[PDB]
Amino acid sequence: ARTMQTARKSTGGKAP
Amino acid sequence: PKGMFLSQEDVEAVSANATAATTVLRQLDMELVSVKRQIQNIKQTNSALKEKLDGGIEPYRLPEVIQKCNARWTTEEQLLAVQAIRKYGRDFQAISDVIGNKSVVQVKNFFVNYRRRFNIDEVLQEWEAE
Amino acid sequence: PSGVEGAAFQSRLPHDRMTSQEAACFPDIISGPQQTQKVFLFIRNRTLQLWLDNPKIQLTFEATLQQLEAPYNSDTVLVHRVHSYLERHGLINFGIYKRIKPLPTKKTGKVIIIGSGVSGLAAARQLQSFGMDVTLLEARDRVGGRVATFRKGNYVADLGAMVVTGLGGNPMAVVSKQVNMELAKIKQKCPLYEANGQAVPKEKDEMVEQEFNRLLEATSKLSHQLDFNVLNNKPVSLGQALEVVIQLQEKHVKDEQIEHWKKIVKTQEELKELLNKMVNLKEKIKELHQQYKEASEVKPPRDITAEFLVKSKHRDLTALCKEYDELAETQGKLEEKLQELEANPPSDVYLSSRDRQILDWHFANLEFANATPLSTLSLKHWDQDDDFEFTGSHLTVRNGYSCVPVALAEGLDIKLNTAVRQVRYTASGCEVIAVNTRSTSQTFIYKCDAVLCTLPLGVLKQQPPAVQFVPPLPEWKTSAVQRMGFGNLNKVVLCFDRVFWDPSVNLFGHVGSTTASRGELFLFWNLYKAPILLALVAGEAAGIMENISDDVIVGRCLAILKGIFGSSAVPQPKETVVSRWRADPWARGSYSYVAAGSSGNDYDLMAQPITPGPSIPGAPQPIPRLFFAGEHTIRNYPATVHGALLSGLREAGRIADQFLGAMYTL
Ligand SMILES: Cc1cc2nc3c(=O)[nH]c(=O)nc-3n(C[C@H](O)[C@H](O)[C@H](O)COP(=O)(O)OP(=O)(O)OC[C@H]3O[C@@H](n4cnc5c(N)ncnc54)[C@H](O)[C@@H]3O)c2cc1C
Cis-peptide, bond into residue C624, ω within 30° of zero: no
Contact C384 A15 (CB under 8 A): no
Q: Which atom of ligand 1 is nearest to the CA of C434?
A: 42
Query: Which amino acid is present at C394?
Result: H
Q: Which atom of ligand 1 is nearest to the CA of C159?
A: 1
The domain spanning residue C62 has which CATH number? 1.10.10.10
Clarify whether residues C392 and C408 are in a common domain.
Answer: no
Query: Which amino acid is present at A4?
Result: M
Clarify whether residues C311 and C256 are in a common domain.
Answer: yes
Clarify whether residues C28 and C52 are in a common domain.
Answer: yes
- Helices C238-297 + C202-224 axis angle, to 10: 110
HEC profile of B44-92: HHHHHHHHHCCCCCHHHCCCCCCCCCCCCCCHHHHHHHHHHHHHHCCCC
CA of C157 to the centre of ligand 1 (A): 16
The domain spanning residue C222 has which CATH number? 3.90.660.10
Q: Are strands C626-628 and C450-453 parallel, antiparallel or unpaired?
A: parallel
Dihedral angle over CA of C437, C443, C447, C448, nearest 10: 0
DSSP assignments along C446-504, one per residue:
EEESEEEE---HHHHH-SS-SSEEESPPPHHHHHHHHHSEE---EEEEEE-SS--S-TT
* Residue C370 covered by a domain: yes
Question: Is residue C353 annotated as involved in ligand binding?
Answer: no
* Residue C98 covered by a domain: no
* Residue C297 covered by a domain: yes
- What letters, b where the CB count within 10 A reaches 16 and e where it falls short, cover C135-161? bbbbbbebbbbbbbbbeeeebbbbbbb
What residues contact residue A13 under an 8 Å CB cut-off, 6+ apart?
C216, C217, C219, C220, C221, C223, C383
Q: Which residues pair with C575 in a beta bridge?
A: C495
What residues contact residue C144 under an 8 Å CB cut-off, 6+ apart?
C117, C118, C160, C401, C402, C405, C406
Residues C89, C650: contact at Cβ < 8 Å? Answer: yes
Burial class (CB in 10 A: 0-12, 13-18, 19+), C393: middle
DSSP state of C39: H
**Alpha helices per DSSP H over C546-640:** 550-565, 601-606
* Residue C96 covered by a domain: no
Split into its structural domains, chain C has a count of 4
Clarify whether residues C23 and C157 are in a common domain.
Answer: no
Clarify whether residues C56 and C128 are in a common domain.
Answer: no
Q: How many helices (H) and strands (E) does chain B have?
A: 6, 0
Residues C421, C440: contact at Cβ < 8 Å? Answer: no
Compute the half-sphere exposure of residue B26: CA atoms within 13 Å on the CB side of its CA: 5
Is C204 an 8 Å CB contact of chain A? no
HEC profile of C162-209: CEECCCECCHHHHHHHHCCCCEEECCCCCCCECCCCCECCHHHHHHHH
Residues C484, C604: contact at Cβ < 8 Å? Answer: no
Q: Which chain A residues are closer than 8 Å to C523 by Cβ?
A: 7
Residues C449, C430: contact at Cβ < 8 Å? Answer: yes
Query: Which amino acid is present at C95?
Result: G
Which of C264, C276, C292 is facing B39, going by the closest CB pair? C264
DSSP state of C378: B
The domain spanning residue C134 has which CATH number? 3.50.50.60
**Alpha helices per DSSP H over C301-437:** 304-341, 353-370, 403-409
* Residue C242 covered by a domain: no
Q: How far apart are CA B27 and CA C139, in angstroms?
A: 59
Task: Find the chain A residues whose C-beta atoms sit closer than 8 A to any C-beta of C.
Answer: 1-8, 10-15
C583: left (phi over 0), alpha (psi -120 to 50) or beta: alpha
CA of C532 to the centre of ligand 1 (A): 23
Q: Are strands C468-470 and C110-114 parallel, antiparallel or unpaired?
A: unpaired
Instruction: Chain C: give the shortest CA distance to residue A6, in Å.
Output: 7
C 241-300: CB under 8 A from B: 243-245, 247-252, 254-255, 257-258, 261-262, 264-265, 268-269, 271-272, 275-276, 278-279, 282, 285-286, 289, 292
Clarify whether residues C369 and C337 are in a common domain.
Answer: no
Mutational test site, ligand 1, from C584, C592, C641, C649, max ligand atoms within 8 Å of CB: C641
Q: Are strands C429-436 and C418-426 parallel, antiparallel or unpaired?
A: antiparallel
Q: Is C235 helix (H, G, I), strand (E, B) or coil?
A: strand
Nearest to C195 by CA among C494, C662, C559: C559
Q: How far apart are CA B112 and CA B127, in angstroms?
A: 17
Nearest to C390 by CA among C164, C111, C56, C75: C164
Clarify whether residues C627 and C609 are in a common domain.
Answer: yes
Clarify whether residues C334 and C188 are in a common domain.
Answer: no
Return the H-helix or E-strand segment holding C278. helix C238-297
Method by which the coordinates were obtained? X-ray
Split into its structural domains, chain B has a count of 1
Q: What domain range includes position B84? A: 1-130
Residues C343, C354: contact at Cβ < 8 Å? Answer: no
Q: What domain range includes position C65? A: 4-88
Instruction: Chain A: give the shortest CA distance to residue C586, in Å.
Output: 22
Clarify whether residues C394 and C541 are in a common domain.
Answer: yes
Burial class (CB in 10 A: 0-12, 13-18, 19+), C534: buried
Contact B6 C264 (CB under 8 A): no
DSSP state of C631: G
- In degrees and rounded to multiples of 5, residue C44 shows phi and psi of -50, -65
Compute the half-sphere exposure of residue C604: CA atoms within 13 Å on the CB side of its CA: 5
Question: Residue C349: closest CA among chain B residues belongs to which residue?
Answer: B29
Clarify whether residues C386 and C528 are in a common domain.
Answer: yes
Residues C571, C497: contact at Cβ < 8 Å? Answer: yes
* Residue C288 covered by a domain: yes
Residue C352 burial (CB count, 10 A):
10
Query: Which amino acid is present at C338?
Result: L
Mutational test site, ligand 1, from C146, C467, C646, C647, max ligand atoms within 8 Å of CB: C146
Q: Which residues pair with C494 in a beta bridge?
A: C533, C576
3-state helix, strand, coil in chain A (%, to 5): 20, 0, 80
Nearest to C239 by CA among C437, C394, C372: C372
List the resolution, Å: 2.9
CA of C630 to the centre of ligand 1 (A): 8
Among B2, B5, B29, pick the best mutation site for testing chain C contact (most C Cβ within 10 A).
B5
The residues after which chain A has a C–N gap greater than 2.5 Å are: none
* Residue C105 covered by a domain: no
Clarify whether residues C456 and C539 are in a common domain.
Answer: no
Q: Is C354 helix (H, G, I), strand (E, B) or coil?
A: helix
Question: Is residue C640 annotated as involved in ligand binding?
Answer: yes
Which of B31, B38, B46 is facing C271, going by the closest CB pair? B46
Q: Which residues pair with C444 in a beta bridge?
A: C434
Contact C165 A6 (CB under 8 A): yes
* Residue C104 covered by a domain: no
Q: Is the CB of C396 under 6 A from ligand 1?
A: no
What residues contact residue C564 under an 8 Å CB cut-off, 6+ apart?
C193, C197, C198, C508, C510
The three-point CA angle C306-C308-C309 to 5° equals 65
Residues C626, C425: contact at Cβ < 8 Å? Answer: yes
Q: How far apart are CA C222 and CA C229, in angstroms?
A: 8
Q: Is the CB of C376 under 6 A from ligand 1?
A: no
The three-point CA angle C491-C371-C494 to 5° equals 10
Clarify whether residues C260 and C225 are in a common domain.
Answer: no
Contact A12 C369 (CB under 8 A): no
What residues contact residue C264 under an 8 Å CB cut-off, 6+ apart?
B39, C338, C341, C342
The domain spanning residue B6 has which CATH number? 1.20.58.1880
- In degrees and rounded to multiples of 5, residue C485 shows phi and psi of -105, 135
Chain centroid to CA C619: how far?
A: 47
